[PDB]
Design a protein around this ligand. Structure first.
Ligand SMILES: *[C@@H]1O[C@H](CO)[C@@H](O[C@@H]2O[C@H](CO)[C@@H](O[C@@H]3O[C@H](CO)[C@@H](O)[C@H](O)[C@@H]3O)[C@H](O)[C@H]2NC(C)=O)[C@H](O)[C@H]1NC(C)=O
Ligand SMILES: *[C@@H]1O[C@H](CO)[C@@H](O[C@@H]2O[C@H](CO)[C@@H](O[C@@H]3O[C@H](CO)[C@@H](O)[C@H](O)[C@@H]3O)[C@H](O)[C@H]2NC(C)=O)[C@H](O)[C@H]1NC(C)=O
Ligand SMILES: *[C@@H]1O[C@H](CO)[C@@H](O[C@@H]2O[C@H](CO)[C@@H](O[C@@H]3O[C@H](CO)[C@@H](O)[C@H](O)[C@@H]3O)[C@H](O)[C@H]2NC(C)=O)[C@H](O)[C@H]1NC(C)=O
Ligand SMILES: *[C@@H]1O[C@H](CO)[C@@H](O[C@@H]2O[C@H](CO)[C@@H](O[C@@H]3O[C@H](CO)[C@@H](O)[C@H](O)[C@@H]3O)[C@H](O)[C@H]2NC(C)=O)[C@H](O)[C@H]1NC(C)=O
Ligand SMILES: *[C@@H]1O[C@H](CO)[C@@H](O[C@@H]2O[C@H](CO)[C@@H](O)[C@H](O)[C@H]2NC(C)=O)[C@H](O)[C@H]1NC(C)=O
Ligand SMILES: *[C@@H]1O[C@H](CO)[C@@H](O[C@@H]2O[C@H](CO)[C@@H](O)[C@H](O)[C@H]2NC(C)=O)[C@H](O)[C@H]1NC(C)=O
Ligand SMILES: *[C@@H]1O[C@H](CO)[C@@H](O[C@@H]2O[C@H](CO)[C@@H](O)[C@H](O)[C@H]2NC(C)=O)[C@H](O)[C@H]1NC(C)=O
Ligand SMILES: *[C@@H]1O[C@H](CO)[C@@H](O[C@@H]2O[C@H](CO)[C@@H](O)[C@H](O)[C@H]2NC(C)=O)[C@H](O)[C@H]1NC(C)=O
Ligand SMILES: CC(C)CCC[C@@H](C)[C@H]1CC[C@H]2[C@@H]3CC=C4C[C@@H](O)CC[C@]4(C)[C@H]3CC[C@]12C
Ligand SMILES: CC(C)CCC[C@@H](C)[C@H]1CC[C@H]2[C@@H]3CC=C4C[C@@H](O)CC[C@]4(C)[C@H]3CC[C@]12C
Ligand SMILES: CC(C)CCC[C@@H](C)[C@H]1CC[C@H]2[C@@H]3CC=C4C[C@@H](O)CC[C@]4(C)[C@H]3CC[C@]12C
Ligand SMILES: CC(C)CCC[C@@H](C)[C@H]1CC[C@H]2[C@@H]3CC=C4C[C@@H](O)CC[C@]4(C)[C@H]3CC[C@]12C
Ligand SMILES: [Zn+2]
Ligand SMILES: [Zn+2]
Lengths: 626, 626
């Protein structure tokens, strides 16, 4: 039977009958026409469904209405409205116009008969345009896909999909032009690149990875939300999701060289400003072998994760900030690796400042008027700043749950090395072995990895950790040891307020909770050392006084950017994608990349406080005050 | 048109016609009947394929003949013979006999017409029997699946699939009874448990994980071999694979307690035999903090791999010996973990022997006639034997490429600690710090992980490693240092023969190649120490003479079982499954589990040689010979 588009056909079909509708149209040699088939059936007899077969010249497509889904824990779902878009055949100038037939056959095995309703339409907004937002609606029985053609200017696009409600859970997939299109639950992750999505998604593509410089963008809704965060609305027989897709061209290669030269010439401006004021006046092996032995678990691991996300299309592994992930060859986020250049550049500059202070100290001993200068741990800290950037750049190749500590765990060593040197400046009788720096670092990683996994924010771990936190502060207070007893009980109250804050709220990101312990204890013992210099008759020279004000304004700026989370391994990867944000600096760097820039500067100026604070006493002779 | 089973129907179909065959049969209320549909088409016009639709009461099934496949690097394959088995509806005593209809519709859009051939048969050997081997043949366009029903006796079965040729690459899947059965390339890994397979497969199942105590065993052949080892025969239009499946009941729970009590009472017999001869006569903290800091990368990792293989059905991750993998709760191979009990039991016994020798040494100093007894590294070795079993049991939770070293890497530390104590017995002036045991261990792990990955068996790594191996032996020879010069050049020739053996063959398993360096250098310097005692006038007491003969017969037995590989992370998981073997001891332990038993005994008796070799000189007074 010859039928018409945009007309709703209704009928009844039983075991003897089979309705056949033949649809006939013509494809123009430049535009593309997509056909969608709508089938209803308001028949709840689920022992005799309505079977619908759609035949084309080169394909056959079949489904049953009502569509059935088997969820977890033995739950069944019905869907009385099924919609499928047939794979379009594109006519070109080598072919001309093409007359195409489509046969739709409706059949059922019910003895009494089953009622249905059929509608076949041509899609008008099938081809997506560049930088134009397009709104549509999908369903677990009504998947959608659209076409995007690459312009000759653009070589890389980003597919930004936005939804204002977290549920139903969905899948956004990118596939080839070659038929068939996989738009069902069991085949959408077969080939192509896909992402799970509750509220946001972002897929970055290259023009060189597609033959005809075109792809399909497939939208499939899931019947349950177990792959996403939740589980299982006024009689939700249909799990409709309102989506909005925008295809934005990526940044050009001039942004790759303008932003990379920024991240070098900013930290090389520290080199020029250091040798200028040098012109005006005109254990490290131990910490590297801790670093590279702690590192090699992730080099053996993140090169497998970065390949699995590339040889498959499973982009649910590596937890990036997908709205600010700029690839370079194999790496999928080059800006997260390039932003750690400030650690290895300012950490190398701090070694050249100590080496200038060490050569000009041995040349003065060949020809007492100060505290004994010990440049041992100063070499140990500038190395530890350099190894912090190497460890965290390896984390950002594929951030996930199995390497989460490697963003900031080596900063516990840096904060531990700073509090030991500040104790060493007026207690030179200490002797910390190279094993003790390895063993005390190994027990603060263990309790971190455990807290996040086993602790799993339960009250059994948080109480006994709060007891460890309050007796550690009670041990270091009298070890440091009359206004001396006044400061040594204020600093316990800051650690006690820190202990009960994590006890009543239980922050799940325990690796960032351990940073707050090591930073505030650093910024208290450094703050108590200045007040002890000012309660005595000791002034502050303008060179350390600049570095104290610099340390306070760079740590307050870095701790602001530290709290804007743009990714989270704590939940599902679709839950982490809801917090993705665009780049805010030079269209290359997000909030987490400025934290890599400003925590390498705040730790550098914290080093320069510990080096030049006691240069008041380099003219005051010894046997005066300790 | 009413049609008959086991009859070949042939016809021609064009755009106007559509042949319809109706098949009618009856299902008995205890047996099960499966229907298979065979379609040929010897028409190479691939612009107008033959479309075949099979309609049942509750399902619709469609495909096109010739079937098309898109391989990697733009290769297309045709298959002119397609065969599908329809999902059977089981009749029970609550239903009685069931009259079932099957409609087969053949259609094509060719203008001239397309020829086909149709055959519809009932499967006779559809239900698999227990402990009966069954041979069949499959194809990439002709998948197969069968039914297995659990007996009331059996609670766990193993599905052993055997093929005598490695190619074509295949997939063996286990699925539920609820229709549809996923037997195509794009849906066979959707739900259920699956395994890739070239030559062998073994899937262990529980009765409690299936609702009706029955499952389907799906066999799907792949169009290419890229997921397996190879790639892409006399005009192989069909990639036929001859398979053979056997379903064997698992071992009972009495085997779980008979084999576990064996592995305790054997190593507790060493305790009873030690205190009996004690009745006849009637740095460790440093090595644990090396161990648990080296361990915590895998506890954060293998608990994710063991869950992913459980929450999905991807059994291509954990590289077990699947023919000797016996589960216990969450773990999928309990015998690989239980076999490491000999390390923690014989390592704890060695500490109690040294502690008995240490308490009876301090009690003798309160009341010279020997070499100075130093029990420092003796505590360090018995701890290192205990931590070797903890590290390798964590490896066998999920062995793969990301944790491969943790089977045997801590034995490099054990062999290194033995060669240092044997140097210490007649050179007591040595002072090896606790950091130097950590730093020298960290550089032999680095060069191992690298050799396996980057080295990747290329000549650029193997030449420069052979140069490191020959100057290390040239450094330790004169450090040990006239028949003394005779032995110190024979031991270089064993290291030189070891250097060129790995250079001309390039063993890819470099972690086992590093074991051969550390073991032979241990078994040479221990062998040279006995000859130096016998070239002088020093006898051997019967207690160390028993332990020397015990060390030689337990290391020769353990190195035999070390070379029978039953798994390999070097290739694809389907390539590793070809080397799986059945258990040889108590139906619980394979060849790799006896290596865990005999290398904990050979290392224990190697400890007892180093402890009691110099008990000749405990009656000879000092100032006699060094
Ligand atoms: C397939 O054949 C058609 C028919 O020739 C091609 O369409 C033609 O494309 C050219 C190039 O874009 C058009 O020229 C343009 O005309 C506009 C005026 O509208 C002018 O402003 C531009 O500067 C340019 O000269 C031409 O009008 C257009 N003709 C028709 C009838 O559409 C088409 O490009 C061919 N496609 C391929 C892939 O070869
Ligand atoms: C299968 O059944 C469903 C529901 O019975 C049909 O959906 C209905 O579609 C019509 C036409 O698109 C909708 O009517 C119009 O809706 C707009 C938007 O709300 C409204 O502004 C108009 O005044 C008009 O009522 C109708 O609302 C919609 N029903 C629901 C519940 O959303 C569907 O069309 C059926 N499929 C076929 C092939 O017949
Ligand atoms: C569904 O109904 C049929 C019909 O009764 C059941 O078949 C019957 O099953 C019993 C138990 O296995 C059979 O008894 C056995 O007979 C053999 C002699 O062949 C004897 O050696 C055994 O000791 C036992 O007594 C019985 O013969 C058999 N009857 C028929 C006609 O097959 C069937 O078990 C029912 N299924 C379910 C799931 O309830
Ligand atoms: C589609 O075409 C293929 C090949 O043209 C058909 O396979 C052929 O099936 C027949 C009957 O099963 C085979 O004949 C018998 O084979 C056995 C085993 O070799 C032999 O011992 C007998 O003497 C007899 O020849 C025939 O060998 C086989 N052809 C090949 C190349 O294996 C298939 O049956 C066709 N499908 C339909 C539905 O007609
Ligand atoms: C359902 O099947 C029956 C027979 O199995 C058919 O019923 C038709 O009913 C109309 C109205 O009474 C009459 O023309 C005949 O009794 C039947 N027509 C034919 C052509 O057999 C029919 O196949 C189905 N009924 C429908 C589609 O309404
Ligand atoms: C689909 O519709 C078109 C018309 O839109 C049909 O084309 C006509 O075909 C007849 C017979 O070949 C010609 O006499 C007419 O002149 C054609 N009209 C046009 C506008 O081209 C076409 O045949 C239809 N397809 C089928 C399969 O029937
Ligand atoms: C192919 O289609 C044509 C028409 O499009 C039909 O050809 C038949 O040929 C036979 C033998 O010459 C004659 O009975 C008629 O010319 C046609 N029969 C009918 C019923 O139209 C037929 O549909 C197809 N040919 C086949 C199946 O052989
Ligand atoms: C399938 O075949 C069976 C016979 O094997 C058919 O059963 C017959 O049905 C007619 C009409 O209802 C009865 O008069 C006969 O007595 C039945 N015979 C038997 C042996 O049961 C059955 O009708 C067929 N199915 C269809 C849909 O035609
Ligand atoms: C902070 C971590 C990550 C890095 C390691 C630095 C800290 C923890 C290390 C380095 C120097 C070490 C201390 C040096 C000296 C002493 C005094 C001794 O009587 C007990 C151990 C103790 C107290 C050491 C253990 C902890 C210590 C303070
Ligand atoms: C994070 C680390 C660096 C903690 C900072 C404190 C370090 C640098 C200093 C501060 C006070 C010091 C302690 C002061 C007093 C004692 C008691 C003495 O019998 C052994 C050393 C010991 C235990 C010192 C170890 C090092 C120490 C703990
Ligand atoms: C074998 C590995 C895995 C475990 C570590 C044990 C070995 C390698 C360690 C422990 C004792 C160490 C040696 C002890 C003393 C010396 C002499 C000194 O002048 C150079 C370093 C050197 C040579 C040390 C480095 C290597 C050494 C032999
Ligand atoms: C795997 C490890 C234990 C190697 C075994 C050899 C160890 C135990 C012994 C054997 C000979 C020893 C060396 C003999 C001579 C020297 C030269 C001296 O100026 C420094 C120590 C040094 C370098 C010794 C270090 C320890 C040493 C290397
Ligand atoms: Zn970071
Ligand atoms: Zn092992």
């Amino acid at each position: 039977r010859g039928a018409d588009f945009d007309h709703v056909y209704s009928g009844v079909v039983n075991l003897s009958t089979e309705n056949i509708y033949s649809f006939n149209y013509t494809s123009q040699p430049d535009q593309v026409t997509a056909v969608r088939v709508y089938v209803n059936s308001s028949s709840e007899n689920l022992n005799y469904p309505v079977l619908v077969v759609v035949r084309q010249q080169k394909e056959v497509l079949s489904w049953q209405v009502p569509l059935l889904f088997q969820g977890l824990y033995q739950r069944s779902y019905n869907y009385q409205e099924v919609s499928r878009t047939l794979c379009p055949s594109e006519a070109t100038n080598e072919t001309g116009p093409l007359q195409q037939l489509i046969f739709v056959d409706v059949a059922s095995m019910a003895p009494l008969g089953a009622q249905y309703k059929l509608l076949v339409t041509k899609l008008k907004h099938f081809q997506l345009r560049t930088n134009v937002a397009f709104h549509f609606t999908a369903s677990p029985s009504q998947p959608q896909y659209f076409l995007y053609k690459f312009p000759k200017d653009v070589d890389s696009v980003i597919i930004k999909v936005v939804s204002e409600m977290a549920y139903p859970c969905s899948v956004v997939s990118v596939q080839n032009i070659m038929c068939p299109v996989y738009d069902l639950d069991h085949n959408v992750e077969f080939n192509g690149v896909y992402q799970s999505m509750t509220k946001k998604a972002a897929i970055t593509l290259q023009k060189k990875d597609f033959p005809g410089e075109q792809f399909f963008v497939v939208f499939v809704i899931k019947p349950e939300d177990y792959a996403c965060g939740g589980s299982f609305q006024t009689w939700n027989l249909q799990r409709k999701k309102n989506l909005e897709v925008t295809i934005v061209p990526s940044i050009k290669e001039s942004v790759y060289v303008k932003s990379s030269l920024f991240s070098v010439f900013i930290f090389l401006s520290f080199y020029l400003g250091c040798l200028l004021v040098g012109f005006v006046h005109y254990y490290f092996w131990n910490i590297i072998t801790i670093a590279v032995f702690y590192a090699l678990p992730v080099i053996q691991l993140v090169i497998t994760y970065q390949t699995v996300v590339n040889v498959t299309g499973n982009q649910d592994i590596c937890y990036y900030n997908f709205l600010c992930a700029h690839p370079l060859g194999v790496l999928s986020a080059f800006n997260n690796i390039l932003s750690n250049l400030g650690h290895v550049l300012l950490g190398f500059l701090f070694l050249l400042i100590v080496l200038r202070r060490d050569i000009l100290h041995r040349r003065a001993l060949e020809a007492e008027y100060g505290i004994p200068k010990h440049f041992g741990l100063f070499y140990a800290m500038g190395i530890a700043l350099m190894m912090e950037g190497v460890l965290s750049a390896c984390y950002h190749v594929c951030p996930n749950y199995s390497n989460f500590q490697f963003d900031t765990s080596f900063m516990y060593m840096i904060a531990g090395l700073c509090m030991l040197k500040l104790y060493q400046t007026r207690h030179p009788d200490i002797n910390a072995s190279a094993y003790s720096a390895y063993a005390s670092f190994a027990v603060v990683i263990m309790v971190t990895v455990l807290g996040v996994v086993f602790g799993k924010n339960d009250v059994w771990f948080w109480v006994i950790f709060s007891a460890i936190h309050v007796l550690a502060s009670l041990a270091l207070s009298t070890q440091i040891y009359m206004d001396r007893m006044v400061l040594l009980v204020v600093g316990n109250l800051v650690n006690w307020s820190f202990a009960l804050f994590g006890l009543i709220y239980r922050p799940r990101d325990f690796a960032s909770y351990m940073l707050g312990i090591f930073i505030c204890n650093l910024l208290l013992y450094l703050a108590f050392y200045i007040i002890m210099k000012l309660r005595s008759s000791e002034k502050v020279l303008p060179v350390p006084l600049f570095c104290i004000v610099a340390t306070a304004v760079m740590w307050a700026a870095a701790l602001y950017f530290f709290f804007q989370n743009l990714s989270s391994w704590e939940g599902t990867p679709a839950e982490s994608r809801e917090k993705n944000r665009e780049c805010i600096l030079l269209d290359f760097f997000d909030d987490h990349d400025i934290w890599h820039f400003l925590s390498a500067t705040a730790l550098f100026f914290s080093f320069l406080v510990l080096l030049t604070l006691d240069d008041d006493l380099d003219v005051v002779r010894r046997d005066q005050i300790p």
